[PDB]
Write a protein that binds this ligand. Structure first.
Ligand SMILES: NC(=O)c1ccc[n+]([C@@H]2O[C@H](COP(=O)([O-])OP(=O)(O)OC[C@H]3O[C@@H](n4cnc5c(N)ncnc54)[C@H](OP(=O)(O)O)[C@@H]3O)[C@@H](O)[C@H]2O)c1
Ligand SMILES: NC(=O)c1ccc[n+]([C@@H]2O[C@H](COP(=O)([O-])OP(=O)(O)OC[C@H]3O[C@@H](n4cnc5c(N)ncnc54)[C@H](OP(=O)(O)O)[C@@H]3O)[C@@H](O)[C@H]2O)c1
Lengths: 416, 416
């Protein structure tokens, strides 16, 4: 794969030296070509979905795999939105004049070569390629073993567009082979890749962090908690919970654990049990909440200790009764994965304390956890939702793929 | 060492929850106590310098280790200057109102627990402790074997101040044993320290990147190049080079390789030889410049292939004659460590090309490479100069020790 690395570096130099007009032109060509070849991509994705259904995959997994024409138009519109955004290369962050007469400033520059290891989702290839082209980085992709044909067709379209627009061919490339030995080799390829973005579960992150030399921005799994305070509207809270759970339960920002204040559980729990039975969501309750949730129509089973630290990725929910805000904060800190946290309350003090004392990539007050998305947050699209602390955090947009450089212009200045 | 980490985390929570007034009070008390107890620090540093010189340490190394009363007053003034800076915690980076009615914003927050492994330099301890206190981080320091008594006294003073002002004693900790097994043990504590700052030569960074599981911001070694164009003022270039080389040659932002355009080399080289000899600097010339530099009084020796990639850390310079700007850029890319580069020229186009095409943490036009400092760049003080690309680059100020967090407020908002 060393030839891939050298090609990526050679293309990255020229990309960093490009102008905004050429990048916008290539993005427009990519979007137009995506719209033109809808039939091929749709047929390949349908065939792949039919193949995956033979293995008895989960309904949520199939929904993630599925690609309707509406979704294709959505990804095309996202590419166009990225095109309409301002180019973040060359922008001045700040500047000034020092005491010695030196004119100093900070200017944004690209990062170099970016490696991406993503899950089985079709659109992610498009978004990553568009963001990397707009910013000025060469990208090496390694997708999941399921979406082989869809990723093949999409990367073929992207590379055809790159060739037609005159950009170097090594700007964007992908690894077709699904063997994980090549994944290890990519991880060891330190002299070429400048930064690696793994998206996936615990196993991929474990293996990567074990055997990585490149800087890593871990996508991380998401255990998102929702805290229900004593003073809250029942109907609105139920609507928010239903939206945060039912809609697309296969994502990573879907709520997984529900923390209910003990002074409200006498009234909130029964209604919830009525609502979940409508959506068919199984309730993994604690011992304290089991007695109240037993009479509810919705099916309820006792929870286990290890279930608090993993994602259900289905129509399941953890119900726990806490004593006060301090207990909820302690539980979130202990079991949370620092992805997204929400509080439903009517107290200004409680909302302020929750916002202050909870460390996460995103904290919401009277809102659903499903807002942790690149498109929703105002950015054109996202490459991954970083849960670490270094470099970017939360959704990673155009500015998350760029670094900065100090430039100082003087007149034969000498440091005193 | 685990108890050290537990104390660090427990102190980090409370420190992140503090206010600006308390941190400023602690810093002012620290500076006052440093000025009050100058005698003990001076005695310890003098004894350490005597012991080091008894081992035949280099003159530049001894100058780095030496701490005069003027230097002590300077570090006290820098601590006070930091105390006078604005607290970066809580600042709003940006924000807005989204389409769905959700008010989004970004707020700065402390990183957490910070581990520092640094060279033998007395002032770095105080600077790191002050910055970590001001930001709201807990710090674990592990200094060089030389600075033992000085670091012991300074850490005693800081711990006493923290105890007196009521802050938890676990905020600032240091390791006294110079064994490197403890260094490895600190390296292996991933879940407890949040970010590591190693300062040192290639050996320390190699060992850290070999067996580290914590995010690392490498200080890195510094090979700083200066390119002399065809048309330039001889006297001004000479004085800038003299300032960049002679003054404090033991630092890391000192010029090592001098690139001279062949068109000007017929006249620039002799004058340089007349000046450099007055400074007593040996010239490790290349083959092309060997004939011209021989007549000059300055000492000249043939350069070796490996000398281009290592710092002299003394009064030594590398003279290489290049063809044009493209050759200089290629050489800088090949051999540079991406620390600080400068160009002395009278052409606007050449300056623009050099600024655009050279990838370094700092690029200067008609200036010196000695400006790559935390204090010079307007920041109060720096913990290290980062030569990597992730997180901060160049000097690391107050904001380099803080990350950000998304906050979203809504009225039971639902994602559409
Ligand atoms: N944090 C974020 O921004 C974000 C975004 C999207 C998804 N996610 C997470 O994605 C997870 C589900 O992803 P998934 O359904 O695709 O399953 P997964 O097992 O998490 O996917 C792992 C990814 O890496 C590969 N992989 C798996 N095991 C590997 C190993 N041992 N060595 C090398 N590569 C390996 C997989 O392809 P192969 O199996 O073919 O090797 C796949 O591309 C959820 O937990 C969710 O939280 C997070
Ligand atoms: N990039 C920057 O911002 C920056 C700033 C300052 C200095 N520097 C660099 O500092 C260098 C000189 O530093 P120096 O004179 O102190 O020498 P050094 O050998 O670079 O110092 C290494 C530092 O780490 C320790 N260390 C050395 N070998 C180690 C090992 N195998 N395992 C663990 N710890 C180890 C040393 O103390 P022990 O030997 O007792 O272990 C010392 O604290 C220059 O090359 C300069 O460029 C860079």
């Amino acid at each position: 794969l060393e030839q891939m690395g050298i090609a990526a570096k050679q293309a990255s130099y020229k990309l960093a030296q490009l102008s905004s007009r050429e990048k916008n032109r290539v993005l427009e060509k990519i979007a137009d070509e995506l719209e033109a070849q809808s039939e091929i991509i749709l047929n390949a994705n349908a065939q792949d979905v039919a193949d995956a259904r033979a293995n008895g995959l989960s309904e949520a997994m199939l929904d993630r795999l599925a690609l309707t024409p509406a979704r294709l138009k959505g990804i095309a519109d996202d590419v166009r939105q990225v095109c309409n955004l301002a180019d973040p290369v060359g922008q001045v962050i700040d500047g000034g004049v020092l005491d010695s007469g030196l004119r100093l400033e900070r200017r944004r520059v690209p990062l170099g070569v970016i490696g991406v290891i993503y899950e089985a989702r079709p659109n992610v290839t498009v978004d990553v390629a568009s963001l990397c082209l707009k910013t000025g980085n060469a990208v090496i992709l390694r997708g999941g073993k399921e979406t082989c044909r869809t990723n093949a067709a999409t990367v073929a379209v992207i590379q055809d567009a790159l060739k037609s627009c005159g950009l170097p061919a090594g700007a964007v490339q992908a690894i077709d082979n699904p063997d994980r030995a090549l994944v290890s080799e990519m991880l060891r390829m330190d002299k070429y890749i400048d930064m690696l973005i793994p998206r996936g579960g615990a196993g991929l992150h474990k293996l990567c962090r074990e055997q990585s030399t490149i800087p890593v921005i871990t996508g991380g799994i998401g255990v998102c908690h929702i805290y229900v305070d004593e003073s809250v509207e029942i109907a609105e809270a139920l609507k928010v919970i239903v939206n945060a759970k039912t809609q697309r339960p296969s994502t990573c920002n879907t709520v997984e654990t529900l923390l209910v204040n003990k002074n409200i559980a006498d009234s909130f729990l029964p209604a919830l049990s009525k609502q979940m039975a409508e959506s068919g969501v199984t309730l993994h309750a604690d011992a304290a909440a089991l007695a109240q949730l037993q009479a509810g129509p919705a099916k309820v089973v006792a929870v286990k200790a290890e279930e608090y630290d993993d994602e259900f990725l289905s129509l399941d929910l953890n119900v726990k009764i806490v004593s006060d805000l301090d207990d909820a904060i302690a539980h979130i800190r202990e079991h949370g994965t620092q992805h997204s946290d929400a509080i439903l309350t009517r107290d200004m003090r409680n909302a302020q304390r929750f916002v202050n004392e909870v460390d996460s990539s995103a904290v919401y007050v009277n809102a659903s956890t499903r807002f942790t998305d690149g498109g929703q947050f105002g950015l054109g699209a996202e490459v991954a939702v970083s849960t670490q602390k270094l470099h970017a955090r939360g959704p990673m947009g155009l500015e998350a793929l760029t670094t900065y450089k100090w430039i100082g212009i003087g007149d034969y200045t000498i440091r005193a």
